[PDB]
Nucleic acid binder design. Structure first.
Length: 859
DNA sequence: TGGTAGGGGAAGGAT
DNA sequence: ATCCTTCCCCTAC
């Protein structure tokens, strides 16, 4: 009618096949149906914003020498209209002088200058980025995308409500959405802020595949999906997290179903669809996605395998209307990039989201359900699924398996709160939520700065087509065991505070660059960090209120977590070499100040006649030689106030006291963290950092025994009795290994691949790659980059190195000639872990520990 | 398609 | 054989 109000969620831009158009996809309220439906708004006529920086004097391009003719704003306009717009076939365009700010990597560019803003249609040819001219030295905005221009010009900071003044009917239906509208010019789209976000339609799904006998390509056997139609991002997840479901199952070419599938299913009353051929199955799933019309599709291992196979089978089987997997009608699918295949619908891979929120040995679905959902997952081998087609009782269990997998995925998504958190991360950064779910953290802070400099009238850098600088300072530790109270001080968010304290920005230094006059106004980068900290503070104050909605404290918690996660990732965007806002000088300047701030702090504490024993990037550990917390906390604040007297915004605080400390090496120690109580007298928990028992590349047999040793060293017992308890247990573990009392899960060590196992220089050298190649030889799910492979080295009767004798745990039970190397774990795993832990404590030796396990003492 | 600093292991030369 | 550098993966900040 007069206006069109909708809540945008995703955007799609086709740079090559349709330039200057940005498709928006979101929700809109239909009062007649009393439900939100999917809508697609087509924003047309996105201009090409260019900026020509005029030279001081007109020079000839061939000679490159000064001709002595001054360059004016009319002369630079002449060269474009005469020699540039004609040579590159730019018929119609616009021109207007403007003043833009700049503070980035291109040299010989003033901070403030007069540029020639030129706007023309995106359907016209694009200029070269390195274009030079007789009147202008450089040109910006050459390859700026339509989506970027639209999001910046209209201040679209994340998913929000938009009004579309003067909406237009679409000639032919371009989208798979319920409602469609068109915008003539980007100026017709504004941001509405006083409206609550709408619930979303979420669909988590899973699928089971199988390799064909003739061709090695996969084949979709069964798919299941759970749907919830009012999944709110503003509050907790619904219980149950799904309202409806559908399950599909088909046959391969040379396979037929067990008897009476329909009747038995009709008898079981389970809502299961039977497809004759796989092509019939895919058409059913596409039509279900089209009718459900979800905003977010959830699954596991989507980009690595599942989505790539789904598109491939649809292409092979020639299933009609492939583009229904997204929301925009398209004639042909891209080659399998390919992330822009489900445009209009967000893709959530729980295995990817888990890698950003939690820490696990392996991030496959089976391991996630064991750690998050506290329930075991049974997986069907890809070799036994062919025999599962013999009896329907074995095949109906196959559907129930994948159907239960879809529920696990949906349950994992809810427990991690990835949807409510991703929206907050997107509304803070001001990017696209689909990119937040999948893309890295670099693209987010890239958008946060692209907005910040657009707000302040800056020309942002164009999108480009060992280490590199010094980092933190780790003081050398005073190795040993400490019986007295150890005090730990550190600076909260040092690098963000360093930026504010010293006004470090692209604009404040002459980037080589050194800190500016403290009288200078706060730069753009520090002022943005100041906002996030102030915003996080205000949210913290809101959590203090009483008589408040119990659902708000959970949402306020999600928000304040996002504010910190954004402010802390700001530094990393400066050191990333492929970052749009790459500034290695600024990154080195920050890290240098951190070292100087730490070094000056350590020397200040030493001048106070205090002994510092360890210090990492921002922390300092002080040995007090006192057993009274009244004097430790008094001395804790005395050092605190003395340090904070030097910095305006940077502050240091007590991070806890240590009852006992086992400081082994750099970044490796164990302590008993003092926790204050209402009684005024502490209770202690242990903290493990850097020790081999904390890592995941050591077996659980050595990590559990080492954790028992750490508990004995930090214990409040006599020195003569601690060594007795370790002896009695270290000889016991040496007996249960050869006796077989310990499970096989205690012998597996986990290492992940940083590249493809075939792309390694030598696979027989590294153990985990040799096991990865064996998994890739089987029919089971492949092991690609980033995947963690658990392996158990065995005894195959060969005198090859213990690393060359590395096998998979599944090979130990299958092959009877592979047995657990008993002497290896007692000498190469359990011994060095316990030996390095007991190195500073007097009494336990390396050879004495080896004699306890039961091996030839040579140490 | 955040960073550097650092430990602990094994491979692969050179000797 | 041993010494040494290189590469590997995982950590702490």
């Amino acid at each position: 009618e007069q206006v069109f109000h909708f809540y945008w969620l995703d955007a799609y831009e086709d740079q090559y096949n349709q330039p200057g158009v940005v498709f928006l996809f979101g929700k809109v309220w239909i009062e007649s149906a009393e439900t939100h439906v999917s809508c697609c708004v087509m924003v047309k006529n996105i201009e090409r914003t260019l900026y020509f920086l005029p030279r001081e004097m007109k020079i000839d391009l061939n000679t490159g020498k000064e001709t002595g003719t001054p360059i004016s704003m009319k002369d630079v306009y002449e060269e474009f209209d005469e020699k540039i717009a004609t040579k590159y076939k730019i018929m119609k365009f616009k021109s207007k002088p403007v003043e833009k700010n700049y503070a980035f990597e291109i040299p010989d560019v003033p901070e403030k200058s007069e540029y020639l803003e030129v706007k023309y249609s995106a359907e016209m040819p694009q200029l070269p980025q390195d274009l030079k001219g007789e009147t202008f030295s450089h040109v910006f905005g050459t390859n700026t995308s339509s989506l970027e221009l639209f999001l910046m010009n209209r201040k679209i900071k994340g998913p929000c409500w938009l009004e579309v003044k003067s909406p237009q009917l679409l000639n032919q239906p371009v989208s798979w959405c319920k409602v469609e509208a068109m915008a003539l010019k980007p100026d017709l789209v504004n941001v509405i802020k006083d409206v609550s976000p709408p619930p979303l339609v979420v669909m988590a799904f899973s699928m089971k595949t199988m390799q064909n006998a003739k061709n090695h390509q996969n084949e979709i056997i069964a798919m299941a999906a759970l749907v919830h139609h009012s999944f709110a991002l503003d509050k907790a997840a619904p219980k149950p997290p799904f309202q409806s479901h559908f399950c599909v199952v088909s046959k391969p070419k040379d396979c037929i179903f067990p008897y009476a599938f329909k009747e038995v299913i009709e008898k079981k009353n389970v809502k299961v669809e039977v497809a004759a051929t796989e092509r019939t199955l895919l058409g059913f799933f596409l039509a279900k996605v089209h009718k459900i019309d979800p905003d977010i599709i959830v699954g596991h291992n989507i980009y690595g395998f599942e989505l790539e196979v789904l598109l491939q089978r649809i292409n092979v089987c020639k299933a009609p209307h492939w583009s229904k997997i997204g929301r925009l009608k398209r004639s042909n699918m891209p080659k399998l990039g390919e992330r822009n295949a489900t445009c209009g619908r967000m893709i959530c891979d729980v295995e990817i989201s888990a890698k950003e929120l939690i820490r696990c040995k392996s991030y496959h679905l089976s391991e996630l359900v064991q750690q998050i959902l506290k329930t075991e997952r049974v997986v069907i081998p890809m070799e036994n699924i062919q025999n599962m087609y013999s009896e329907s009782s074995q095949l109906l269990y196959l559907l129930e398996h994948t159907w239960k997998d879809a529920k696990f995925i949906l349950q994992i998504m809810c427990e991690l709160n990835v949807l409510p958190l991703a929206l907050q991360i997107t509304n803070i950064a001001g990017n696209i939520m689909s990119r937040t779910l999948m893309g890295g953290r670099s693209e987010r802070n890239e958008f946060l700065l692209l907005h910040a400099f657009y707000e302040n009238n800056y020309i942002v850098p164009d999108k480009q087509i060992k280490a590199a600088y010094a980092g933190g300072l780790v003081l050398d530790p005073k190795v040993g065991f400490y019986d007295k109270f150890i005090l730990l001080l550190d600076f909260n968010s040092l690098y963000p505070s360093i930026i504010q304290e010293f006004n470090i920005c692209f604009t404040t230094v002459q980037r080589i660059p050194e800190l500016p006059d403290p009288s200078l106004e706060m730069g753009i980068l520090p002022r943005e960090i100041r906002k996030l900290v102030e915003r996080r503070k205000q949210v913290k104050q809101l959590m203090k209120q009483q008589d408040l909605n119990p659902d708000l404290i959970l949402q306020y918690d999600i928000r304040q977590k996002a504010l910190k996660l954004t402010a802390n990732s700001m530094y990393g965007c400066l050191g990333f070499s492929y970052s749009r806002f790459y500034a290695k000088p600024l990154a080195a300047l920050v890290t240098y100040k951190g070292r100087e701030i730490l070094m000056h702090t350590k020397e200040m504490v030493q001048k106070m006649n205090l002994e510092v024993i360890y210090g990492d990037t921002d922390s300092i550990m002080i040995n007090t030689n006192s057993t009274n917390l009244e004097e430790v906390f008094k001395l804790g604040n005395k050092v605190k106030s003395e340090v904070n007297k030097l910095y305006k915004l940077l502050e240091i605080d007590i991070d806890g006291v240590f009852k006992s400390l086992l400081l082994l090496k750099k970044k490796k120690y164990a302590a008993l963290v003092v926790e204050p109580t209402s009684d005024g007298n502490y209770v202690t928990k242990q903290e493990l950092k850097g020790l081999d028992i904390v890592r995941r590349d050591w077996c659980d047999l050595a990590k559990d025994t080492g954790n028992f040793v750490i508990g004995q060293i930090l214990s409040d017992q006599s020195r003569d009795t601690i060594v007795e308890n370790i002896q009695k247990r270290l000889i016991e573990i040496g007996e249960n290994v050869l006796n077989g009392s310990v499970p096989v899960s205690q012998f597996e060590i986990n290492k992940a691949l940083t590249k493809d196992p075939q792309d390694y220089p030598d696979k027989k050298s590294l153990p985990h790659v040799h096991v990865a190649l064996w998994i890739n030889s089987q029919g089971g799910r492949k092991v690609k980059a980033g995947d963690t492979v658990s392996y158990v080295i065995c005894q195959d009767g060969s005198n090859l190195t213990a690393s060359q004798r590395a096998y998979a745990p599944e090979q130990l039970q299958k092959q009877d000639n592979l047995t657990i190397d008993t002497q290896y774990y007692l000498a190469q795993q359990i011994h060095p872990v316990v030996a390095r832990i007991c190195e500073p404590i007097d009494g336990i030796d390396a050879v004495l520990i080896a004699t306890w396990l039961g091996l030839d003492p040579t140490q």
